[PDB]
Design a protein around this nucleic acid. Sequence first.
DNA 1: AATAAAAGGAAGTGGG
DNA 2: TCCCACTTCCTTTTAT
Length: 88
Amino acid sequence: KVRLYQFLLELLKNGDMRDCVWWVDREKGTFQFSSKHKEMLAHRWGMQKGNRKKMTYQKMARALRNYGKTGEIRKIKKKLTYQFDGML
DNA sequence: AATAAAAGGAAGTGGG
DNA sequence: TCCCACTTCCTTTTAT
């Protein structure tokens, strides 16, 4: 069972869905979602988990906020911008 | 100004 | 039965 943070890391590490998510600084671990195409990346995540309802970015973002300010993925005060931990 | 994003409480869910 | 790791629903609060 793949976790949400690993799924996102794998996408960026493999250059998958580059129009939906992209690194902002690979060294600092910061990445950013696509304001226009983020919902298509969100749906993929819902399929890998086989949820009953359709996955939305709002729901994926609700899951990301659970990791916390020192956890796997953290929120950065920039639009649609997050950051991985030193596990890079 | 309108829109998008961000937030989060709390129950609900399948996994182990 | 117990968490884990989200999922779902909803309303509220900020940023763009």
